[PDB]
Amino acid sequence: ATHRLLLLGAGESGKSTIVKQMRILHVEKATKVQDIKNNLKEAIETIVAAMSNLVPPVELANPENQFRVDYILSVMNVPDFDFPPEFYEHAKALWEDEGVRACYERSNEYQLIDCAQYFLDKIDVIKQDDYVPSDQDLLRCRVLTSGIFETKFQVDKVNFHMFDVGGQRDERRKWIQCFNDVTAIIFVVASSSYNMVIREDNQTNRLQEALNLFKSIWNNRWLRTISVILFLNKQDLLAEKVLAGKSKIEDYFPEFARYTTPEDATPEPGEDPRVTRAKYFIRDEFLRISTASGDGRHYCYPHFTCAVDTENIRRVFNDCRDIIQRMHL
Template sequence: MGCLGNSKTEDQRNEEKAQREANKKIEKQLQKDKQIYRATHRLLLLGAGESGKSTIVKQMRILHVNGFNAEEKKQKIQDIKNNIKEAIETIVAAMSTLAPPVQVACPENQRRIEYITNLPNQKNFEFTSEFYEHAKKLWQDDGVKACYERSNEYQLIDCAQYFLDKIEIVQQSDYTPSDQDLLRCRVLTSGIFETRFQVDKVNFHMFDVGGQRDERRKWIQCFNDVTAIIFVVASSSYNMVIREDNLTNRLQEALNLFKNIWNNRWLRTISVILFLNKQDLLAEKVLAGKSKIEEYFPEFARYTTPDDATPEPGEDLRVTRAKYFIRDEFL
């Protein structure tokens, strides 16, 4: 009775061997990728609109990802110019809608207001020397400055003063944004943006998600395998209202949002880090004394600074009290 020999050819055996080796390499790479994945900290930035989440991402990029290259800086120039246009348009428009309204200090500037009011609302607006001249003169007007001082009564971007003070620099043909300009530049975040960086050989993936109410439905897409949520609060927003309804206090909106996240049973295994942002702006408001916290949060009148509070070097104790009050509202 004859024996059946090995029917596989030499080529087939070599092919199977190569396949086994390829599978081993794939398995090894998968294990390696899994280890890297487990060693990567995924940070999700959440918070109400205009709390400064995108600024934190930009700071991480400047500090840990070689910053922004020349081409990226060039692309940001248009956004910065748009910030100037939006700022002066918003202030000028508010002058007649505030109660009581605000008048220009110099009658000659009324024609400049008319010029700004009639600017076209187009994406690629041409920034002429005429525009800069009118914007510059208006920003120097005491009436316009008085309207700016009441910016908590209407919606104005945080970087308004910063860039209006820099009109002379920004309008130069050879202008290149500084890192501070890039940090201050305001662009509405819509969607989900990921930034990867490394600190002391530890990998981080940071996800920035829009904070406006209509953007929050996208948050659920980001919760999977998140190491920690960094909840960002604009400390200076105690006297402002949200853009969405021009009614709800911004700090109260942040408090409600934080409590919803904290009490969400699906997020109980995720660490939550509270990041109190814009404390420099908070200090300015407290020291100016025009918008008192107790007018918006009556409980502040009875608040006592904790015994273990640690003021910053040279910090006014009124600012320290305000900072700790806002912290304790969340905690």
């Protein structure tokens, strides 16, 4: 038995990450170090560069730090950056400046990678010359996907061929090549990106784009009888935004003001009612689309997900094996 699974979703939704969990779970670290340092550099310069362009502009809480700012910006476009020990000191100095931090809290108003906070919180760890990336470091390291990639693995002597594709608008033209003869589709969605917009144009709401992309896949003429497993990914960041209270969901999706938690809903132990409500609301916007057309030709299987948690993925992928083998997929 050999099942071919295809990973689909908008850019930065977490597809490539889901695959890394399959390696860590069922299947040259030094090469990833340079990538982690690139995420670290890209993060500090993105936050600093957005300080003057926001409305209202964010001010540094320390004059001294302006010099570190000039430093950071001067080495922004450098091709081969050797990462001197000065670089980490300056970056760390800025990341401690409240002005910089306040600007970070308004990162939904500009384009910033998801691993910003993670890598910046451990600059002292990454700067060491004897530094060895952890599992969590590799799962966070972001690197855009371009073209198709095919992974192989086994679970109880059952074969899985996974396909990872680019999620950005341009890269999508390639998806088609994997459509014929697919067992199931895993559609990933960044549940937490409701207060954000896509990189491609800097206007379209990230969640909306996801919704559109899903409706396009669900009603595709070539995927009429292909079931879709839906990962409502980035659950961790969703809960954090919800509880924080700053960015209100109902300001991006007015329909949320009428939404109430369903009865059959199952919260996690000790889960806040507010959180429960948000994640379920998002789930229903996706289910609402899948319910409009299909007729039992193909089904939709929701799943609350958090790709960077090797533990949550182990669990959910097991729910997935059940879905596949069971329904005769």
